[PDB]
Design a binder for this molecule. Structure first.
Ligand SMILES: Nc1nc2c(c(=O)[nH]1)N[C@H]1C(S)=C(S)[C@@H](COP(=O)(O)OP(=O)(O)OC[C@H]3O[C@@H](n4cnc5c(=O)[nH]c(N)nc54)[C@H](O)[C@@H]3O)O[C@H]1N2
Ligand SMILES: Nc1nc2c(c(=O)[nH]1)N[C@H]1C(S)=C(S)[C@@H](COP(=O)(O)OP(=O)(O)OC[C@H]3O[C@@H](n4cnc5c(=O)[nH]c(N)nc54)[C@H](O)[C@@H]3O)O[C@H]1N2
Ligand code: SF4
Ligand code: SF4
Ligand code: SF4
Ligand SMILES: [Mo]
Ligand SMILES: [Zn+2]
Ligand SMILES: [Zn+2]
Lengths: 438, 131, 568, 79, 264
């Protein structure tokens, strides 16, 4: 019955911080959680569990898995990181920004490849940002000004549940006092998703033809739109002209994109034609692209490694004094394919589940270490499983929202007696490696 | 028959993973095909029956249902997870983003065959399936 | 604890010109006398100054991180790294422009600099700035929250509540741990949120019907009433267009009725920054010449106006200013990348690469303008050196700026290697100009100017008793300046030594250690206003996505603060 | 004064039924708010209707039209 | 006049042998060449630890000529920044062959991995295998990329052919895949086979000769004329399309210039 305000929900890009927890009398049981979506409710319900991992656990010859002390696990990982020739550390989607700084230091000492879930998720988007730029905005800007909203290839209803009710559509802002009723929502994707149910338009496009769709829109905008064919990407020219007229007349627009663009043919060229469209629309209106980042602090590795090495992802830290970045050559999946690794470290992700199984097969040839709070597929095919605190429930810190706005997450439960957090763990690994004098 | 395919999200799927990747909720949420009613009739797939989704980079036995989110004739959909990534092709096009949406696949109605659990799928792909 | 024996001293705050004085640092603070247990430094024949202070530099923040992401060509180009290859310190140095935090810290340490004032920060994005500051290595650092497009400061300067606006500025500063006030494109940046711009000083903001003049005057009244250390740092309007010297004079005439009242020593009331950007003349880029003469005539008249130059270093760079319209206009000029980051109820942003190459009349004249500004200054204490890093070039080109000032052979060389020399000399005045700023003058406008203007000359910027023990020793002798200007370049590029509060951190130009750093802020002590408390709560409930209890940087997310306290 | 029923089994906690209800929007979005009572609040991930005795609803259909995956049934007949 | 390299020890991982250029091999003793640096993983090898040398290099790179005769199919960075001379790879190859090259020529007798000829500025390449994607593509985050020289991929190309190309020529004797000449500004691309589509997107200026069949034409190109053109061959009577009307166009003296894509 000790109600705690302003907590952070640590799952989706929304980084919602309007969460209220009613912690038990002893400060270690969560009773009721208000204002959060279900996916979040379950995160907190799992964090407040009574039967949770407390010590590392090693793979014995028999194939079972027995516990070891933290110092022994740190010794194991340090010795292996030094003995290896090009270790790969992957993850960082779900960690505080101190967890993504400590890891950068550890792999600076080691000399391996450091990488995050950007490669497999919105890294194709960054590659377009490198090409064309990122005309964007914070989310309060679309809350308080947006007149048109476009969800191109995204599905907020199931990806980011309270995105619509917090930032985009339903809130009544300052210059949008009328709320939804003066917002025009356009949703583009081949399915008739729940976002399209809520929407007012829908451009059911053939899966994979978004490049042709964007080119049609941009010819319309550039002015001689009469040269369009009868239909484009399955969309009909009159509907194209309708949506384009709405976009032109928008007082302040905003485009959101997701897997529909970053996981189909022409991974980054879809995103950069979208960005070109936004830059073209800002000739006569105000339009701001914006990427639907997935995990809470998945924009955290981007900024932290931007300030540390200058490169958001796919870091080639093997020269030990100059880093390199080329996603086609230094990314986790391509290196796993070309068996270019020597050790895989699972930190803040589920590589076993969410990688292609050929890549997982290629990777498991080498040692495999997992730093997770709870059991998952990586912790089931790893060699040792080091527990760690959960961001936002057992430990606080900074996280980075969809739009690179830092939210400060709070602590609601003390972690089980013995369990440390990743910044302490990565720092101890780095200290032990320097002790081993490499 | 060529039957283009995508792999995407669902709230029940997110809920399931945060219950736990090894839970009955996760099994129920992810082992799912959400295809079109016209395609189900034309192929010969009984609603709520196992089916063999076999692409060039694998194979998986997955329950076949119909989804509210109306897939147009010629589209498939698995909620992302163990089962979908058993069949996702690894081609990246030198970008690091595998072909997670938009790969061809053939669908074969194969009832009377069980579904493979998440642990069984992954630990057997690696060669660790003790149980 | 340390003494620097027998080195030429240049302390403008004490009027010392080439004396063989001895500085006895004792536990971080300079003291007159220390016993014979202090390790000595034989600085014979070496020019000693104080630890330089930089007043305007964007070495952190969301703008800079957006640039670092958007521009990976910056680190790697044509096969080899333009940032050079080096690991002197315990970490890496990546980046030619917009260097990573570990390169900025080390490069300033090698420069001799010790304090850097990260100019613009959106107040909502304060944990970002304080996180990058924890990672910068040796330099002490403060950041200036931007209050010239805040909606709360549009309401209060509309309705004429000096007390309420002062209470709000104190609350903001106490939340974002800032040190002053920056007005970036007064009013116009918010009209950019709709897509427009305030092209003059008089036009109203959309829906607010307040003007740049009114907002600048209101913020000046607020600042001088609270007695904040640093004045109202001002950007200006009609940036980067020909003929805007008239508007620059119009905006500089806004201080004619104020006096700097504070317990700190500063004579400014407003600080007009990168003025070589505001000192253009003519109609377009084909009838474009320099108005630096007029700008510096006005500044040489007025004693409550201090400036700095934005000298362009003639290379490739990314330009980051908190105002949108200038960056968008630049993108439409050169057809290169463009990034825009609108903040909620606060500011704008814009990142655009740009090539200041030598083969353009426009870039040549832009280079000449800053030199004309600096060489027309009768009082150098009021005109400082920055480059608006990286807007006019990276800071690793400060010694190039100092070479250009101190050796007219350098300027003749650059003007001769320039392509349209005839056009540049016809449309400027720097070809026939003899002035070579002396070593005393350069120490003045590098160390004492910025410190005294920031109103913290007590601790930084001088070698007088009680100051903070930050000393920077250089190679060159003050008796005879080098014949070859490249010698000056190297001498200011690499320092013979550098001390940070008593601990030597650079030797021969090679990093040695990194003890720690401070992050200065302002600590206005004053009873709260129920009216501003209510207005802030209402505005966060209705308009801001973050919460009121999560807006203030937590007490544990700041790195060794050392506030500067105030009263009422 | 009608009766709304929320299917807890498919409610995702999206909170777009709370934000869109025009009786909820009375407190913070009106000049001189008249009544400050609220029909829905999302407790434990599902929308709970505090309007137990069916006194504040007005059968507007803004909440039924808002929920992305239809889950709110509006009853126009006396309970 | 020539150098012979023969792989003796197989490296378990990929060797970044950037040091293998005529520029580094010119005017060096055999022991020195054998001790030129070469990385592998996070370790640095000496390049005599994986090769056996037999030859005499010239005083100048324009004189010397390297011949690699082993399974160098896991070796990357061959030819990097090669200014003049000659290289031969009597096998296949991996990533960055000929990267940022300014002259000379590389005659890979086999395949090639991605990033072949990245930002090249002159010289020749004579691959007879199936080059992967990013052939001639500019480095990530750049706008002025390949600006001269010749690439001759005698097999199936891939994605991102001639991205942000500025000058020169990329000839693909086989066929291609999506995204040819995106963001480009000048030069030619001569594809002699089936192309999936997306050719010429974002183009500001340039030429893209195609002798196969576009299966997905972009909406941004319209047919304006049927012209005869002798491109790598003889009169093939192309029906040119004009410009990417989706993207802004640079204007010349008194005329707007379009990026015209040709077709069979
Ligand atoms: N078929 C298909 N597969 C896909 C995709 C697709 O589109 N289709 N998308 C791919 C993409 S977009 C990515 S993001 C992946 C996403 O997939 P993942 O990135 O793997 O996301 P999760 O599986 O939820 O990882 C959460 C794990 O991190 C743990 N964790 C939580 N907090 C912390 C912390 O603070 N510290 C540490 N050390 N651990 C913590 C959690 O307990 C959990 O074990 O899916 C990918 N796989
Ligand atoms: N419950 C739950 N929530 C999540 C996640 C989860 O796994 N479970 N993952 C989180 C993370 S890691 C991610 S990155 C985010 C991302 O989630 P989102 O970026 O929002 O994307 P998706 O949810 O996968 O749905 C993408 C939509 O694009 C459609 N689409 C597919 N192909 C195309 C195409 O070719 N063109 C167009 N125009 N549309 C196409 C798809 O049908 C789908 O409707 O969600 C996050 N939220
Ligand atoms: S939208 Fe995401 S961050 Fe917000 S409550 Fe739901 S799961 Fe948490
Ligand atoms: S019908 Fe209208 S008044 Fe009633 S609960 Fe729904 S939105 Fe509120
Ligand atoms: S809008 Fe629908 S799904 Fe969302 S909380 Fe309300 S009833 Fe549940
Ligand atoms: Mo993701
Ligand atoms: Zn400025
Ligand atoms: Zn500035």
């Amino acid at each position: 019955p000790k109600v705690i305000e302003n907590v952070g929900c640590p799952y989706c890009g929304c980084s919602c911080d309007d969460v209220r927890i009613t912690v038990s009398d002893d400060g270690k049981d969560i009773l009721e959680v208000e204002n959060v979506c279900a996916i979040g409710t379950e995160i907190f319900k799992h964090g407040c569990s009574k039967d949770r991992i407390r010590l590392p656990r090693m793979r014995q010859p028999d194939g079972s898995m027995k516990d070891i002390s933290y110092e022994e696990a740190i010794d194991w990982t340090a010795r292996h990181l030094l003995k290896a020739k090009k270790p790969l550390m992957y993850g960082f989607g779900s960690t505080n920004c101190e967890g993504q700084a400590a890891a950068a230091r550890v792999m600076e000492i080691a000399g391996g490849m450091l990488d995050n879930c950007a490669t497999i998720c919105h890294g194709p988007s960054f590659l377009a940002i490198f090409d064309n730029g990122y005309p964007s905005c914070t989310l309060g800007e679309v809350k308080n000004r947006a007149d048109v909203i476009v969800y191109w290839g995204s599905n907020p209803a199931h990806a980011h549940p309270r995105h619509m009710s917090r930032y985009s559509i339903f809130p009544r802002g300052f210059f949008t006092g009328k709320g939804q009723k003066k917002r025009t929502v356009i949703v583009i994707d081949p399915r008739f998703t729940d976002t399209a149910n809520v929407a007012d338009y829908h451009l059911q496009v053939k899966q994979g033809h978004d490049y042709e769709l964007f080119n049609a829109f941009r010819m319309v905008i550039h002015g001689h739109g009469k040269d369009l064919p009868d239909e484009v990407a399955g969309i009909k020219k009159e509907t194209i002209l309708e949506v384009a007229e709405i976009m032109k007349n928008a007082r302040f627009g905003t485009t959101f994109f997701g897997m529909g663009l970053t996981h189909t043919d022409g991974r980054n060229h879809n995103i950069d034609i979208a960005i070109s469209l936004t830059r073209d629309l800002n000739k006569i209106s105000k339009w701001t692209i914006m990427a639907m980042r997935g995990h809470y602090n998945i924009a955290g590795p981007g900024v932290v490694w931007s300030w540390t090495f200058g490169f958001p992802y796919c870091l080639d830290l093997t020269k030990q004094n100059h880093a390199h970045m080329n996603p086609g050559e230094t990314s986790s999946v391509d290196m796993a394919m070309r068996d270019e690794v020597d050790m895989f470290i699972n930190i803040g992700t589920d590589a076993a589940a969410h990688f292609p199984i050929p890549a997982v097969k290629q990777l498991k040839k080498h040692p495999w270490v997992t730093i997770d709070p709870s059991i998952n597929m990586a912790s089931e095919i790893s060699d040792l499983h080091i527990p760690v605190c959960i961001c936002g429930v057992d430990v606080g810190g900074i996280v980075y929202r969809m739009d690179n706005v830092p939210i400060q997450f709070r602590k609601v439960i003390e972690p089980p007696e013995g369990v440390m957090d990743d910044e302490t763990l990565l720092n101890k690994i780095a200290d032990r490696m320097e002790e081993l004098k490499a | 028959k060529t039957l283009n395919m995508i792999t995407q999200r669902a709230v029940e799927e997110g809920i399931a993973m945060e219950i736990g990747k090894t839970s009955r909720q996760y099994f129920d949420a992810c082992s799912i095909i959400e295809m079109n009613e016209q395609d189900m009739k034309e192929l010969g797939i009984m609603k709520n029956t196992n089916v063999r989704v076999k692409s060039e980079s694998g194979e998986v036995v997955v329950k076949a249902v119909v989804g509210r989110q109306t897939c147009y004739p010629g589209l498939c959909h698995i909620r992302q997870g163990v089962w979908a990534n058993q069949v996702v092709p690894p081609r990246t096009q030198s970008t690091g983003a595998p072909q997670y949406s938009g790969f061809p696949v053939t669908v074969e109605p194969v009832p009377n065959e069980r579904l493979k659990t998440a642990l069984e799928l992954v630990q057997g792909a690696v060669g660790m399936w003790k149980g | 604890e340390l003494l620097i024996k027998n080195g030429y001293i240049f302390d403008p705050i004490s009027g010392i010109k080439g004396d063989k004085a001895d500085i006895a640092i004792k536990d971080g603070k300079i003291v007159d006398k220390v016993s014979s247990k202090a390790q000595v430094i034989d600085a014979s024949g070496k020019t000693v100054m104080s630890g330089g202070v930089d007043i305007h530099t964007h070495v952190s923040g969301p703008k800079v991180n957006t640039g670092r992401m958007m521009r990976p060509e910056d680190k790697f180009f044509r096969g080899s790294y333009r940032g050079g290859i080096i690991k002197q310190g315990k970490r890496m140095e990546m980046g030619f422009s917009i260097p990573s935090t570990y390169k900025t810290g080390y490069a300033y340490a090698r420069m001799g600099y010790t304090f850097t004032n990260e100019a613009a920060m959106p107040p909502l994005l304060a944990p970002h700035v304080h996180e990058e500051f924890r990672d910068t290595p040796i330099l002490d650092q403060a950041a200036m929250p931007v209050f010239g497009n805040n909606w709360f400061c549009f309401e209060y300067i509309k309705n004429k509540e000096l007390e309420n606006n002062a209470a709000y500025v104190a609350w903001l500063l106490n939340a974002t741990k800032g040190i002053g006030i920056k007005v970036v494109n007064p009013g116009g940046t918010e009209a950019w949120a709709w897509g427009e711009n305030c092209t003059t000083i008089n036009d109203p903001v959309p829906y607010f019907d307040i003007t740049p003049a009114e907002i600048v005057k209101g913020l000046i009244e607020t600042n001088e009433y609270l007695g904040l250390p640093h004045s109202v740092h001002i950007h200006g309007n009609n940036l980067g267009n020909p003929g805007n010297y008239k508007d620059t004079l119009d905006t500089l005439r806004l201080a004619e009725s104020y006096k700097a009242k504070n317990k700190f020593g500063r004579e400014q009331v407003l600080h007009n920054t990168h003025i070589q950007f505001h000192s253009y003349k003519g109609t377009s880029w084909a009838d474009f010449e320099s108005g630096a003469k007029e700008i510096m005539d006005y500044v040489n008249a007025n004693k409550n106006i201090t400036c700095d130059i934005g000298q362009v270093t003639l290379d490739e760079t990314t330009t980051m200013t908190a105002d949108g319209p200038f960056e968008y206009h630049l993108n439409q000029l050169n057809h290169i990348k463009w990034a825009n980051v609108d903040v909620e109820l606060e500011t704008g942003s814009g990142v655009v690469p740009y090539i200041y190459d030598k083969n353009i009349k426009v870039c040549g004249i832009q280079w000449a303008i800053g030199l004309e500004l600096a060489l027309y200054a009768k009082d150098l204490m009021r005109v400082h050196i920055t480059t608006d890093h990286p807007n006019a070039g990276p800071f690793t080109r400060y010694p190039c700026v100092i070479k250009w000032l101190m050796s007219e052979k350098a300027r003749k060389a650059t003007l001769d290697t320039m392509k349209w020399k005839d056009k540049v000399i016809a449309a400027s005045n720097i070809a026939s100009m003899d002035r070579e700023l002396g070593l005393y003058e350069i120490a003045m406008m590098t160390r004492a100017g910025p410190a005294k203007a920031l109103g913290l000359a007590a601790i930084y910027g001088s070698l007088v008793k009680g100051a903070d023990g930050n000393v920077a020793i250089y190679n060159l002798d003050a008796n005879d300046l080098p014949s070859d200007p490249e010698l000056i370049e190297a001498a200011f590029q690499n320092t013979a030594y550098t001390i940070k509060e008593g601990v030597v951190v650079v030797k021969d130009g090679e990093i040695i250690a990194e003890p720690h750093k401070y992050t200065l802020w302002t600590k206005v002590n004053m009873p709260e206003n129920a009216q501003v408390m209510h207005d802030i709560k209402e505005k966060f409930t209705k308009n801001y996505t973050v919460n009121l209890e999560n807006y203030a940087v937590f007490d544990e997310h700041v790195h060794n603060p050392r506030a500067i306290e105030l009263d009422v | 004064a009608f009766a709304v029923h929320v299917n807890m089994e498919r409610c995702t906690g999206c909170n777009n039924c709370v934000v869109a209800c025009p009786v909820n929007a009375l407190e913070l979005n009106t000049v001189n708010p008249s009544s400050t009572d609220k029909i829905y609040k999302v407790i434990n991930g599902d929308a709970v209707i505090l309007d137990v005795k069916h006194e504040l609803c007005a059968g507007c259909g803004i909440c039924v039209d808002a929920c992305p995956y239809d889950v709110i049934q509006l009853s126009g007949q006396p309970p | 006049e020539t150098i012979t390299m023969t792989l003796v020890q197989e490296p378990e991982l990929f060797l970044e042998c950037y040091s293998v250029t005529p520029d580094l091999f010119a005017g060096k003793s055999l022991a020195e060449i054998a001790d030129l640096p070469a990385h592998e993983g996070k370790i640095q090898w000496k390049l005599g630890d994986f090769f056996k040398f037999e030859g005499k290099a010239g005083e100048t790179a324009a004189d010397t000529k390297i011949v690699v005769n082993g399974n160098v199919r896991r070796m990357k960075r061959f030819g990097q920044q090669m200014t003049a001379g000659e290289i031969i790879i009597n096998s296949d190859a991996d990533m960055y062959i000929g990267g940022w090259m300014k002259g000379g020529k590389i005659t890979v007798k086999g395949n090639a991995d991605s990033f072949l000829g990245i930002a090249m500025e002159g010289g020749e390449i004579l691959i007879e295998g199936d080059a992967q994607n990013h052939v001639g593509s500019a480095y990530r985050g750049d706008w002025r990329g390949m600006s001269g020289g010749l690439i001759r991929v005698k097999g199936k190309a891939g994605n991102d052919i001639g991205t942000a190309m500025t000058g020169g020529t990329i000839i693909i004797e086989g066929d291609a895949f999506i995204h040819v000449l995106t963001h480009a500004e000048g030069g030619t691309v001569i594809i002699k086979g089936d192309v999936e589509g997306r050719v010429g997107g974002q183009m500001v200026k340039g030429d893209a000769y195609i002798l196969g069949n576009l299966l997905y034409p972009l909406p941004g190109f319209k047919k304006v004329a049927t012209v005869e053109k002798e491109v790598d061959g003889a009169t093939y009577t192309f029906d040119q399309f004009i410009g990417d009307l989706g993207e802004r166009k640079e204007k010349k003296k008194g005329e707007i210039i379009y990026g015209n894509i040709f077709l069979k």
